Design a protein around this ligand. Sequence first.
Ligand SMILES: [Co+2]
Lengths: 87, 87
Amino acid sequence: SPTNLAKVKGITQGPNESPSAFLERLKEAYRRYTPYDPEDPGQETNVSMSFIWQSAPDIGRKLERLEDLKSKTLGDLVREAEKIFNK
Amino acid sequence: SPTNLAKVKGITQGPNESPSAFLERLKEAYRRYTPYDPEDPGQETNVSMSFIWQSAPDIGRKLERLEDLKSKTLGDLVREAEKIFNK
Ligand SMILES: [Co+2]
């Protein structure tokens, strides 16, 4: 599909949706509606920021407060979100 | 300031504001409210996405449609935005 950033911003984690399932849906939107490959090392911070911003609000607020946030990989962020999601 | 992604999302080009002045404010928000340095080359596609998304909608829609958008530098996007802004 032709580039449409709104489609990427429109991927929001559902109330029952696991962080890893949400991340896969977010990556699919990057693939379909941007020229950026969400698996590229150069895109990690970009996907990470969308992941944090568009996670369910309780999760997003906690991910944003992680210590040494800059050091967190996309995999780290998913694991931290899962801790909040699973309790 | 402590990380606060809403402040980055809240930087939007003003109705009469030049693209270059808007990008300066967007970079300032990245510096103040994220751990991501907007002058780090590793962050350029991240700042570029925010710039397209948060530009005035007429400009952002045109930037989305640039041929070979993936190869545009942040400096390229600003120049093309300035070309649109100045008629
Ligand atoms: Co496509």
